[PDB]
Amino acid sequence: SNTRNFVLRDEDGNEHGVFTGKQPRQAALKAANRGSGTKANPDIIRLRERGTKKVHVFKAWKEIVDAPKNRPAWMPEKISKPFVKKERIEKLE
DNA sequence: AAAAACACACACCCA
DNA sequence: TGGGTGTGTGTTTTT
């Protein structure tokens, strides 16, 4: 087992919080929570990976859609779906 | 193309 | 309270 953290950065060089996961799929998911505009509106952020020598940058957007179905009580109703658009993960060896 | 990331093995995983 | 498909372990999809 192994766990790589991620440090989300904004746009002006200022970084926000730090994630503690592993899979880029669910990591990029929470990155799109920027809230830039609404549905249609491009955005680009870069989370520095805290573990391996690699830069993480991807485009992502959110769409307000859904409704109270069978989601766990804490987070029901409707949520803006984030689109993990793999821009380019940099490499370093 | 080669590093970087994903496929189910299981069912998990945090406020 | 279970989303949505994680981690784990190998390699696969990525890049």
Side-chain angles (χ1 to χ4, degrees):
Chain A
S1 306
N2 200 0
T3 295
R4 56 170 164 183
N5 307 273
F6 289 89
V7 227
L8 173 87
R9 161 165 283 182
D10 203 79
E11 233 288 279
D12 56 9
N14 292 267
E15 51 272 286
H16 293 270
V18 48
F19 293 111
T20 65
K22 269 136 289 169
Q23 295 320 326
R25 310 220 281 208
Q26 212 199 89
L29 206 69
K30 314 173 220 215
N33 284 29
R34 279 245 289 179
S36 307
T38 31
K39 178 174 151 54
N41 201 36
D43 207 11
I44 271 176
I45 25 59
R46 41 240 95 128
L47 8 174
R48 293 75 59 78
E49 192 204 289
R50 178 176 275 171
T52 331
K53 317 154 291 181
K54 15 234 278 184
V55 188
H56 283 61
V57 71
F58 15 91
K59 171 187 294 116
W61 78 93
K62 256 174 163 268
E63 307 220 357
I64 308 178
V65 276
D66 227 311
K69 288 199 280 260
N70 54 276
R71 253 72 51 118
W74 334 287
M75 276 310 302
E77 287 257 305
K78 64 269 177 183
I79 51 168
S80 20
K81 233 71 183 197
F83 294 67
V84 173
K85 195 281 168 199
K86 292 147 165 279
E87 213 54 272
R88 220 316 189 82
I89 292 158
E90 307 297 89
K91 318 191 176 229
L92 186 58
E93 250 304 279

